[PDB]
Design a protein around this ligand. Structure first.
Ligand SMILES: Nc1ncnc2c1ncn2[C@@H]1O[C@H](CO)[C@@H](O)[C@H]1OP(=O)(O)S
Ligand SMILES: [Cl-]
Length: 209
């Protein structure tokens, strides 16, 4: 028996619509915000940019939070991850995920997930960007990416942003949005720290493509 393309928590229809819309609104507010317009120079090499279109490659339907990319067993650690009891036991089970913030970079747009310890048991254990950052920090839901961005980039961007946060490089909020504080981290990187964390319902399972 061969494994799925990847495991992860797949959000319900309602939760997907909720998070997707939040993302959409965020991209609109950020693109319309004076602080972002002022930094367009550091966002793209080549006025006003429409972020919703910039992140043109979007998830077509149900949003998800990936745990372990398996590539049908070809990826390193896939077989080992799939055979775990906690993965087999948690298969088809319902979980609540906690979104702590929404972020944007020149490459990707996504939402940061804060996994509970229970959920962390489903996080694989096998990057340099993960130095100092606790396991699971990479957890996220991708909302979009630029034309020529490869998979797995959103997680790498999130870790990079969480790294700057680690060293108190967040910086004073450059603005306020209805959902929370807006932070400019430089190099086209932006983070909205939500005043109230968003809770989404999701089913843990494998996607076979
Ligand atoms: N090493 C990887 N290669 C391809 N996709 C990966 C990898 N690691 C995690 N993923 C994720 O698995 C899903 C299908 O590609 C996507 O969610 C990929 O992550 P994203 O950052 O959301 S594009
Ligand atoms: Cl991690």
């Amino acid at each position: 028996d061969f494994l799925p393309l990847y495991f992860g928590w797949f959000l319900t229809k309602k939760s997907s619509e909720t998070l997707r819309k939040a993302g959409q609104v965020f991209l609109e507010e950020l693109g319309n915000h004076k602080a972002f317009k002022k930094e367009l120079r550091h966002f793209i090499s080549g006025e006003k940019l429409e972020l919703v279109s910039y992140f043109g490659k979007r998830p077509p339907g149900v949003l998800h939070c990936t745990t372990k990319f398996c590539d049908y067993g070809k990826a390193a650690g896939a077989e080992e991850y799939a055979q775990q009891e906690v993965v087999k036991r948690s298969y088809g089970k319902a979980f609540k995920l906690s979104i702590s913030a929404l972020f944007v970079t020149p490459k990707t747009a996504g939402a940061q997930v804060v996994l509970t310890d229970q959920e962390l048991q489903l996080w694989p254990s096998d990057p340099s960007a993960s130095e100092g950052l606790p396991p699971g920090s990479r957890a996220h839901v991708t909302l979009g990416c630029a034309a020529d961005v490869q998979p797995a980039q959103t997680g790498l961007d999130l870790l990079d942003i969480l790294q700057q946060v680690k060293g108190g490089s967040q910086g004073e909020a450059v603005g306020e949005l209805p959902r929370g504080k807006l932070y400019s981290l430089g190099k086209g990187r932006w983070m909205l720290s939500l005043t109230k964390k968003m809770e989404v319902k999701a089913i843990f399972t494998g996607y076979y493509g």
